[PDB]
Amino acid sequence: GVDHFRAMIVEFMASKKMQLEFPPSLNSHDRLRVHQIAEEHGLRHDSSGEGKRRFITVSKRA
Protein backbone atom coordinates (compact mmCIF):
# COMPACT_ATOMS: atom_id res chain seq x y z
CA GLY A 1 0.00 0.00 0.00
CA VAL A 2 1.51 3.29 1.20
CA ASP A 3 3.12 3.13 4.67
CA HIS A 4 2.83 6.95 5.05
CA PHE A 5 -0.88 6.46 5.85
CA ARG A 6 -0.09 3.64 8.29
CA ALA A 7 2.32 5.88 10.23
CA MET A 8 -0.35 8.64 10.34
CA ILE A 9 -3.00 6.16 11.56
CA VAL A 10 -0.47 4.75 14.09
CA GLU A 11 0.06 8.26 15.52
CA PHE A 12 -3.75 8.70 15.59
CA MET A 13 -4.14 5.28 17.33
CA ALA A 14 -1.47 5.96 19.98
CA SER A 15 -2.86 9.52 20.44
CA LYS A 16 -6.55 8.25 20.37
CA LYS A 17 -7.77 11.80 19.61
CA MET A 18 -11.36 11.42 18.24
CA GLN A 19 -11.36 11.23 14.41
CA LEU A 20 -8.96 11.98 11.52
CA GLU A 21 -10.08 13.29 8.13
CA PHE A 22 -7.84 11.98 5.31
CA PRO A 23 -8.12 13.81 1.92
CA PRO A 24 -10.34 12.82 -1.08
CA SER A 25 -7.05 12.54 -3.08
CA LEU A 26 -6.82 8.80 -2.16
CA ASN A 27 -7.19 7.28 -5.63
CA SER A 28 -8.48 3.78 -4.79
CA HIS A 29 -5.72 1.73 -3.15
CA ASP A 30 -4.90 4.50 -0.62
CA ARG A 31 -8.58 4.90 0.45
CA LEU A 32 -8.92 1.11 0.62
CA ARG A 33 -5.73 1.13 2.75
CA VAL A 34 -7.12 3.74 5.22
CA HIS A 35 -10.27 1.53 5.42
CA GLN A 36 -8.21 -1.67 5.92
CA ILE A 37 -5.94 -0.26 8.70
CA ALA A 38 -9.08 1.13 10.37
CA GLU A 39 -10.89 -2.24 10.04
CA GLU A 40 -7.83 -4.14 11.34
CA HIS A 41 -7.81 -1.76 14.33
CA GLY A 42 -10.94 -0.41 16.05
CA LEU A 43 -11.76 2.54 13.78
CA ARG A 44 -15.07 3.35 12.06
CA HIS A 45 -13.92 4.26 8.54
CA ASP A 46 -16.50 6.12 6.39
CA SER A 47 -16.66 8.84 3.69
CA SER A 48 -17.83 12.37 4.63
CA GLY A 49 -18.39 15.83 3.07
CA GLU A 50 -21.33 17.59 1.38
CA GLY A 51 -20.31 18.73 -2.16
CA LYS A 52 -17.10 18.38 -4.22
CA ARG A 53 -15.11 18.58 -0.92
CA ARG A 54 -15.64 14.91 -0.04
CA PHE A 55 -13.12 13.24 2.32
CA ILE A 56 -12.45 9.95 4.17
CA THR A 57 -12.96 9.88 7.91
CA VAL A 58 -11.76 7.35 10.44
CA SER A 59 -13.09 7.50 14.01
CA LYS A 60 -11.31 6.08 17.09
CA ARG A 61 -13.35 3.71 19.19
CA ALA A 62 -11.39 4.63 22.36
Side-chain angles (χ1 to χ4, degrees):
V2 167
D3 193 62
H4 309 144
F5 299 108
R6 186 180 181 222
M8 289 189 285
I9 316 211
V10 169
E11 172 176 296
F12 173 53
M13 281 282 295
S15 199
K16 62 156 191 284
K17 286 274 183 176
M18 279 286 72
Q19 49 155 100
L20 194 172
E21 294 164 65
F22 282 116
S25 317
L26 279 11
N27 300 112
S28 309
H29 300 260
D30 320 88
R31 189 161 72 261
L32 160 148
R33 197 73 195 116
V34 172
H35 293 312
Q36 282 175 341
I37 303 174
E39 196 198 72
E40 192 183 299
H41 295 319
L43 311 180
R44 181 166 201 286
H45 51 91
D46 198 3
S47 318
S48 309
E50 195 291 298
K52 290 87 166 53
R53 292 225 74 251
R54 183 167 93 126
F55 52 101
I56 168 76
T57 297
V58 280
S59 322
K60 278 263 32 278
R61 283 97 172 214

Coordinates of all heavy atoms in Angstrom, one line a residue:
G1 N 0.9 -1.2 0.0 CA 0.0 0.0 0.0 C 0.9 1.2 0.0 O 1.8 1.4 -0.9
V2 N 0.7 2.1 1.0 CA 1.5 3.3 1.2 C 1.7 3.4 2.7 O 0.7 3.5 3.4 CB 0.9 4.5 0.6 CG1 1.6 5.8 1.0 CG2 0.9 4.5 -1.0
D3 N 2.9 3.2 3.2 CA 3.1 3.1 4.7 C 3.0 4.5 5.3 O 2.7 4.6 6.5 CB 4.5 2.5 5.0 CG 4.6 2.2 6.5 OD1 3.8 1.3 6.9 OD2 5.5 2.7 7.1
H4 N 3.0 5.6 4.6 CA 2.8 7.0 5.1 C 1.5 7.0 5.8 O 1.4 7.5 6.9 CB 2.8 8.0 3.9 CG 4.0 7.9 2.9 ND1 3.9 8.1 1.6 CD2 5.3 7.7 3.3 CE1 5.2 8.0 1.1 NE2 6.1 7.7 2.1
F5 N 0.4 6.5 5.2 CA -0.9 6.5 5.9 C -0.8 5.6 7.1 O -1.3 6.1 8.1 CB -2.0 5.9 5.0 CG -2.2 6.7 3.7 CD1 -1.8 6.2 2.5 CD2 -2.7 8.0 3.8 CE1 -1.8 7.0 1.3 CE2 -2.8 8.8 2.7 CZ -2.3 8.3 1.4
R6 N -0.2 4.5 7.1 CA -0.1 3.6 8.3 C 0.5 4.5 9.4 O -0.1 4.5 10.5 CB 0.6 2.3 8.0 CG 0.6 1.5 9.3 CD 1.2 0.1 9.2 NE 1.1 -0.6 10.5 CZ 2.0 -1.3 11.1 NH1 3.2 -1.6 10.6 NH2 1.7 -1.8 12.4
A7 N 1.7 5.1 9.2 CA 2.3 5.9 10.2 C 1.4 7.0 10.7 O 1.3 7.2 12.0 CB 3.7 6.4 9.7
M8 N 0.6 7.7 9.9 CA -0.3 8.6 10.3 C -1.4 8.0 11.2 O -1.7 8.5 12.3 CB -1.0 9.4 9.1 CG 0.0 10.3 8.5 SD -0.7 11.4 7.2 CE -0.9 10.3 5.9
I9 N -2.0 6.9 10.8 CA -3.0 6.2 11.6 C -2.4 5.6 12.9 O -3.1 5.6 13.9 CB -3.7 5.0 10.8 CG1 -4.2 5.5 9.3 CG2 -5.0 4.6 11.5 CD1 -5.4 4.9 8.7
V10 N -1.1 5.2 12.9 CA -0.5 4.8 14.1 C -0.3 5.9 15.1 O -0.6 5.7 16.3 CB 0.9 4.1 13.7 CG1 1.8 3.7 14.9 CG2 0.5 2.7 13.0
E11 N 0.0 7.1 14.6 CA 0.1 8.3 15.5 C -1.3 8.5 16.1 O -1.5 8.6 17.3 CB 0.6 9.5 14.8 CG 0.4 10.8 15.7 CD 1.0 12.0 15.0 OE1 2.2 12.1 14.8 OE2 0.2 13.0 14.7
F12 N -2.4 8.5 15.2 CA -3.8 8.7 15.6 C -4.3 7.6 16.6 O -5.0 8.0 17.5 CB -4.5 8.7 14.3 CG -6.1 8.8 14.4 CD1 -6.7 9.8 15.2 CD2 -6.8 7.8 13.7 CE1 -8.1 9.8 15.3 CE2 -8.2 7.9 13.8 CZ -8.8 8.8 14.6
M13 N -3.8 6.4 16.4 CA -4.1 5.3 17.3 C -3.5 5.5 18.7 O -4.2 5.5 19.7 CB -3.6 4.0 16.7 CG -4.6 3.4 15.6 SD -6.1 2.6 16.3 CE -5.3 1.2 17.1
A14 N -2.2 5.7 18.7 CA -1.5 6.0 20.0 C -2.0 7.2 20.7 O -2.3 7.2 21.9 CB 0.0 6.1 19.6
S15 N -2.3 8.3 20.0 CA -2.9 9.5 20.4 C -4.3 9.4 20.9 O -4.8 10.1 21.8 CB -2.7 10.5 19.3 OG -2.8 11.9 19.7
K16 N -5.1 8.5 20.2 CA -6.5 8.3 20.4 C -7.4 9.5 20.5 O -8.2 9.7 21.4 CB -6.9 7.2 21.4 CG -6.4 7.5 22.8 CD -7.1 6.8 23.9 CE -6.8 7.4 25.3 NZ -5.5 7.0 25.8
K17 N -7.2 10.5 19.6 CA -7.8 11.8 19.6 C -9.3 11.7 19.6 O -9.9 11.8 20.7 CB -7.2 12.6 18.4 CG -5.8 13.0 18.7 CD -5.7 14.3 19.5 CE -4.2 14.7 19.7 NZ -4.0 16.0 20.3
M18 N -9.9 11.6 18.4 CA -11.4 11.4 18.2 C -11.6 10.8 16.8 O -12.0 9.7 16.7 CB -12.1 12.8 18.4 CG -12.5 13.3 19.7 SD -13.8 12.5 20.7 CE -13.1 10.9 21.2
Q19 N -11.3 11.6 15.8 CA -11.4 11.2 14.4 C -10.2 11.9 13.7 O -9.5 12.7 14.2 CB -12.7 11.6 13.8 CG -13.1 13.0 14.1 CD -14.1 13.6 13.0 OE1 -15.3 13.6 13.3 NE2 -13.6 14.0 11.9
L20 N -9.9 11.4 12.4 CA -9.0 12.0 11.5 C -9.6 12.0 10.1 O -10.1 10.9 9.7 CB -7.7 11.1 11.6 CG -6.4 11.8 11.0 CD1 -5.2 11.0 11.3 CD2 -6.5 12.0 9.4
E21 N -9.6 13.1 9.5 CA -10.1 13.3 8.1 C -8.9 13.2 7.2 O -8.0 14.1 7.2 CB -10.7 14.7 8.1 CG -11.9 14.9 8.9 CD -12.2 16.4 9.1 OE1 -12.5 17.1 8.2 OE2 -12.1 16.8 10.3
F22 N -8.8 12.2 6.4 CA -7.8 12.0 5.3 C -8.5 12.6 4.0 O -9.7 12.6 3.8 CB -7.5 10.5 5.2 CG -6.5 10.0 6.3 CD1 -6.9 9.0 7.2 CD2 -5.2 10.5 6.3 CE1 -6.0 8.5 8.2 CE2 -4.3 10.0 7.3 CZ -4.7 9.0 8.2
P23 N -7.6 13.1 3.1 CA -8.1 13.8 1.9 C -8.8 12.9 0.9 O -8.6 11.7 0.8 CB -6.9 14.5 1.3 CG -5.7 13.5 1.7 CD -6.2 13.1 3.1
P24 N -9.7 13.5 0.0 CA -10.3 12.8 -1.1 C -9.3 12.3 -2.1 O -9.7 11.4 -2.8 CB -11.3 13.8 -1.8 CG -10.7 15.2 -1.4 CD -10.0 14.9 0.0
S25 N -8.1 12.8 -2.1 CA -7.1 12.5 -3.1 C -6.6 11.1 -3.1 O -5.8 10.7 -3.9 CB -5.9 13.5 -2.7 OG -6.3 14.8 -2.5
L26 N -7.1 10.2 -2.2 CA -6.8 8.8 -2.2 C -7.5 8.2 -3.4 O -8.8 8.2 -3.4 CB -7.3 8.2 -0.8 CG -6.3 8.4 0.4 CD1 -5.2 9.3 0.1 CD2 -7.0 8.7 1.7
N27 N -6.7 7.8 -4.3 CA -7.2 7.3 -5.6 C -8.2 6.1 -5.5 O -9.4 6.3 -5.7 CB -6.0 6.9 -6.5 CG -5.1 8.1 -6.7 OD1 -3.9 8.2 -6.2 ND2 -5.5 9.1 -7.4
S28 N -7.7 5.0 -5.1 CA -8.5 3.8 -4.8 C -7.8 3.1 -3.7 O -8.2 3.0 -2.5 CB -8.7 2.9 -6.0 OG -9.2 3.6 -7.1
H29 N -6.6 2.6 -4.0 CA -5.7 1.7 -3.1 C -5.4 2.4 -1.8 O -5.3 1.7 -0.8 CB -4.4 1.4 -3.9 CG -4.6 0.6 -5.1 ND1 -4.5 -0.8 -5.3 CD2 -4.9 1.1 -6.4 CE1 -4.7 -1.1 -6.6 NE2 -5.1 0.0 -7.3
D30 N -5.3 3.7 -1.8 CA -4.9 4.5 -0.6 C -6.1 4.6 0.3 O -6.0 4.4 1.5 CB -4.5 5.9 -1.1 CG -3.6 5.9 -2.3 OD1 -4.3 6.0 -3.4 OD2 -2.4 5.8 -2.2
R31 N -7.3 4.8 -0.3 CA -8.6 4.9 0.4 C -8.9 3.5 1.1 O -9.1 3.4 2.2 CB -9.7 5.4 -0.5 CG -11.0 5.7 0.3 CD -11.9 6.6 -0.6 NE -12.5 5.8 -1.7 CZ -12.2 5.8 -3.0 NH1 -11.2 6.5 -3.4 NH2 -12.9 5.1 -3.8
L32 N -8.8 2.5 0.2 CA -8.9 1.1 0.6 C -7.9 0.8 1.7 O -8.3 0.1 2.7 CB -8.8 0.2 -0.6 CG -8.5 -1.3 -0.4 CD1 -9.2 -2.1 -1.4 CD2 -7.0 -1.5 -0.5
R33 N -6.7 1.3 1.7 CA -5.7 1.1 2.7 C -6.2 1.8 4.0 O -6.2 1.1 5.1 CB -4.3 1.6 2.4 CG -3.2 1.1 3.3 CD -3.0 -0.4 3.0 NE -2.2 -1.0 4.2 CZ -2.6 -2.0 5.0 NH1 -3.8 -2.5 4.9 NH2 -1.8 -2.4 6.0
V34 N -6.6 3.1 4.0 CA -7.1 3.7 5.2 C -8.3 2.9 5.8 O -8.2 2.7 7.0 CB -7.5 5.2 4.9 CG1 -8.3 5.9 6.0 CG2 -6.3 6.0 4.5
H35 N -9.2 2.4 5.0 CA -10.3 1.5 5.4 C -9.7 0.3 6.1 O -10.1 0.0 7.2 CB -11.1 1.1 4.2 CG -12.0 2.2 3.6 ND1 -12.8 3.1 4.3 CD2 -12.1 2.4 2.3 CE1 -13.4 3.8 3.3 NE2 -13.1 3.5 2.1
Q36 N -8.8 -0.4 5.5 CA -8.2 -1.7 5.9 C -7.5 -1.5 7.3 O -7.7 -2.4 8.1 CB -7.2 -2.2 4.9 CG -8.0 -2.8 3.7 CD -7.1 -3.3 2.6 OE1 -6.0 -2.8 2.4 NE2 -7.6 -4.2 1.8
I37 N -6.6 -0.6 7.4 CA -5.9 -0.3 8.7 C -7.0 0.0 9.8 O -6.9 -0.6 10.9 CB -5.0 0.9 8.5 CG1 -4.0 0.6 7.3 CG2 -4.2 1.3 9.8 CD1 -3.1 1.8 7.0
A38 N -8.0 0.8 9.5 CA -9.1 1.1 10.4 C -9.9 -0.1 10.8 O -10.2 -0.3 12.0 CB -10.0 2.2 9.7
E39 N -10.1 -1.0 9.9 CA -10.9 -2.2 10.0 C -10.1 -3.3 10.8 O -10.6 -4.0 11.7 CB -11.2 -2.8 8.6 CG -12.3 -3.9 8.6 CD -12.2 -4.7 7.2 OE1 -11.2 -5.5 7.1 OE2 -13.1 -4.5 6.4
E40 N -8.8 -3.3 10.6 CA -7.8 -4.1 11.3 C -7.7 -3.7 12.8 O -7.6 -4.5 13.7 CB -6.5 -4.0 10.6 CG -5.5 -5.1 11.1 CD -4.2 -5.0 10.4 OE1 -4.1 -5.1 9.2 OE2 -3.2 -4.7 11.1
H41 N -7.8 -2.4 13.0 CA -7.8 -1.8 14.3 C -9.3 -1.7 14.8 O -10.1 -2.6 14.5 CB -7.2 -0.4 14.3 CG -5.7 -0.4 13.9 ND1 -4.8 -1.3 14.4 CD2 -5.1 0.4 13.1 CE1 -3.6 -1.0 13.8 NE2 -3.7 0.0 13.0
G42 N -9.6 -0.7 15.6 CA -10.9 -0.4 16.1 C -11.3 1.0 15.6 O -11.5 1.9 16.5
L43 N -11.4 1.2 14.3 CA -11.8 2.5 13.8 C -13.0 2.4 12.8 O -13.0 1.6 12.0 CB -10.6 3.2 13.0 CG -9.2 3.3 13.6 CD1 -8.2 4.0 12.7 CD2 -9.3 4.1 14.9
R44 N -14.0 3.3 13.0 CA -15.1 3.4 12.1 C -14.6 4.2 10.9 O -14.4 5.4 11.1 CB -16.4 3.9 12.7 CG -17.5 3.9 11.6 CD -18.9 4.1 12.2 NE -20.0 3.6 11.3 CZ -20.4 4.2 10.2 NH1 -19.9 5.3 9.7 NH2 -21.4 3.6 9.5
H45 N -14.3 3.6 9.8 CA -13.9 4.3 8.5 C -15.2 4.5 7.8 O -16.0 3.6 7.6 CB -13.0 3.4 7.7 CG -13.4 1.9 7.5 ND1 -14.1 1.5 6.4 CD2 -13.0 0.9 8.3 CE1 -14.2 0.1 6.5 NE2 -13.6 -0.3 7.7
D46 N -15.4 5.8 7.3 CA -16.5 6.1 6.4 C -16.1 7.3 5.6 O -15.2 8.0 5.9 CB -17.7 6.4 7.2 CG -19.1 6.4 6.5 OD1 -19.1 6.1 5.3 OD2 -20.1 6.5 7.1
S47 N -16.9 7.7 4.5 CA -16.7 8.8 3.7 C -17.6 9.9 4.2 O -18.6 9.6 4.8 CB -17.0 8.6 2.2 OG -16.4 7.3 1.8
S48 N -17.2 11.2 4.1 CA -17.8 12.4 4.6 C -17.7 13.5 3.7 O -16.9 13.5 2.7 CB -17.2 12.7 6.0 OG -17.1 11.6 6.9
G49 N -18.4 14.6 3.9 CA -18.4 15.8 3.1 C -19.7 16.0 2.3 O -20.4 15.0 2.0
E50 N -20.1 17.3 2.0 CA -21.3 17.6 1.4 C -21.2 17.6 -0.2 O -21.7 16.7 -0.8 CB -21.8 18.9 2.0 CG -23.3 19.2 1.7 CD -23.6 19.5 0.3 OE1 -23.0 20.5 -0.3 OE2 -24.3 18.8 -0.4
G51 N -20.4 18.5 -0.7 CA -20.3 18.7 -2.2 C -19.0 18.1 -2.7 O -18.6 17.1 -2.2
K52 N -18.4 18.8 -3.6 CA -17.1 18.4 -4.2 C -15.9 18.5 -3.3 O -14.8 18.6 -3.7 CB -16.8 19.1 -5.5 CG -17.8 18.7 -6.7 CD -19.1 19.5 -6.7 CE -19.8 19.3 -8.0 NZ -20.0 17.9 -8.4
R53 N -16.1 18.6 -2.0 CA -15.1 18.6 -0.9 C -15.3 17.3 0.0 O -15.3 17.4 1.2 CB -15.1 19.9 -0.2 CG -14.6 21.1 -1.1 CD -13.6 22.0 -0.4 NE -12.3 21.4 -0.3 CZ -11.7 20.9 0.8 NH1 -12.2 20.9 2.0 NH2 -10.4 20.5 0.7
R54 N -15.5 16.2 -0.7 CA -15.6 14.9 0.0 C -14.3 14.6 0.7 O -13.3 15.2 0.3 CB -16.0 13.9 -1.1 CG -16.2 12.5 -0.5 CD -16.8 11.5 -1.5 NE -15.8 10.7 -2.3 CZ -15.8 9.4 -2.4 NH1 -16.8 8.7 -1.9 NH2 -14.9 8.7 -3.0
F55 N -14.3 13.7 1.6 CA -13.1 13.2 2.3 C -13.4 11.9 2.9 O -14.6 11.3 2.8 CB -12.6 14.2 3.4 CG -13.7 14.7 4.4 CD1 -13.7 14.2 5.7 CD2 -14.5 15.8 4.0 CE1 -14.6 14.7 6.6 CE2 -15.4 16.3 5.0 CZ -15.5 15.8 6.3
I56 N -12.4 11.2 3.5 CA -12.5 10.0 4.2 C -12.2 10.3 5.6 O -11.3 11.0 6.0 CB -11.5 8.9 3.5 CG1 -11.2 7.6 4.3 CG2 -10.2 9.6 3.0 CD1 -12.4 6.6 4.3
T57 N -13.0 9.7 6.5 CA -13.0 9.9 7.9 C -12.7 8.5 8.6 O -13.3 7.5 8.1 CB -14.3 10.5 8.4 OG1 -14.5 11.7 7.8 CG2 -14.4 10.6 9.9
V58 N -12.0 8.5 9.6 CA -11.8 7.4 10.4 C -11.9 7.9 11.9 O -11.4 8.9 12.2 CB -10.4 6.7 10.1 CG1 -10.5 5.8 8.9 CG2 -9.3 7.6 9.9
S59 N -12.7 7.1 12.7 CA -13.1 7.5 14.0 C -12.5 6.5 15.0 O -12.5 5.3 14.7 CB -14.6 7.4 14.2 OG -15.3 7.9 13.0
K60 N -11.9 6.9 16.1 CA -11.3 6.1 17.1 C -12.3 5.6 18.1 O -12.8 6.4 18.8 CB -10.2 6.8 17.9 CG -8.8 6.8 17.2 CD -7.9 5.7 17.7 CE -8.4 4.3 18.1 NZ -8.9 4.4 19.5
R61 N -12.5 4.2 18.1 CA -13.3 3.7 19.2 C -12.3 3.7 20.3 O -11.3 3.0 20.1 CB -13.9 2.3 18.9 CG -15.1 2.2 17.9 CD -14.6 1.9 16.5 NE -15.8 1.6 15.6 CZ -15.8 0.8 14.6 NH1 -14.8 0.1 14.2 NH2 -17.0 0.5 14.0
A62 N -12.4 4.5 21.3 CA -11.4 4.6 22.4 C -11.0 3.3 22.9 O -9.8 3.0 23.0 CB -11.9 5.6 23.5

